[PDB]
Amino acid sequence: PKWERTNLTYRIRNYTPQLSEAEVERAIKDAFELWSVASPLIFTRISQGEADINIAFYQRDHGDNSPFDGPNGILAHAFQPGQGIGGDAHFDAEETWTNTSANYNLFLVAAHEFGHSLGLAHSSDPGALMYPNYAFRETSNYSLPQDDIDGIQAIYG
Numbered sequence: 398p399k400w401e402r403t404n405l406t407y408r409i410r411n412y413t414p415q416l417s418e419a420e421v422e423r424a425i426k427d428a429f430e431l432w433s434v435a436s437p438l439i440f441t442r443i444s445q446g447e448a449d450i451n452i453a454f455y456q457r458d459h460g461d462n463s464p465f466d467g468p469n470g471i472l473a474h475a476f477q478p479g480q481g482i483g484g485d486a487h488f489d490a491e492e493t494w495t496n497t498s499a500n501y502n503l504f505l506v507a508a509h510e511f512g513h514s515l516g517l518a519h520s521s522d523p524g525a526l527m528y529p530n531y532a533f534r535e536t537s538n539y540s541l542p543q544d545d546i547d548g549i550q551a552i553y554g
């Protein structure tokens with residue numbers, strides 16, 4: 398399942414109150430950039446209305462038949478390319494969200510979720526971004542591991 402147009406739109410529907418609105422927007426922006434530098438896809442922010450990729454923070458039962466589970470465990474989930482819920486990414490509102498090494502770094506989590514949003518499945522490489530379990534990595538000069546580049550190149554490359 399892959400997107401048919403190169404220019405995709407996204408919307409942040411709501412926020413977490415543990416970080417400034419600036420810092421949530423920056424984490425989402427930089428997460429999309431990681432995939433933009435390794436594919437033809439171009440990502441455009443909208444403020445209101447219906448975008449290709451809806452981003453939201455939600456708790457327990459939230460309308461999609463995949464409920465969240467409260468503190469820790471499942472951190473987020475994203476749907477594959479398609480109409481409607483296709484491509485949308487949901488983040489567990491009950492987590493502590495950070496811009497640091499402390500559980501859990503919103504940039505790193507969103508980076509992984511957006512891979513799903515674009516057609517990727519999980520990787521068996523423990524050093525990949527698309528590995529099933531969360532692991533902190535120094536974020537200052539973060540770029541995608543080579544495994545994830547191979548991933549998006551096989552789809553859109």
Ligand SMILES: [Ca+2]
Nearest residue numbers: 467469471489
């Ligand atoms: Ca959780």
Ligand SMILES: [Ca+2]
Nearest residue numbers: 449481482483
């Ligand atoms: Ca969508």
Ligand SMILES: [Zn+2]
Nearest residue numbers: 459461463487
């Ligand atoms: Zn959901």
Ligand SMILES: [Zn+2]
Nearest residue numbers: 509513519529
């Ligand atoms: Zn995943």
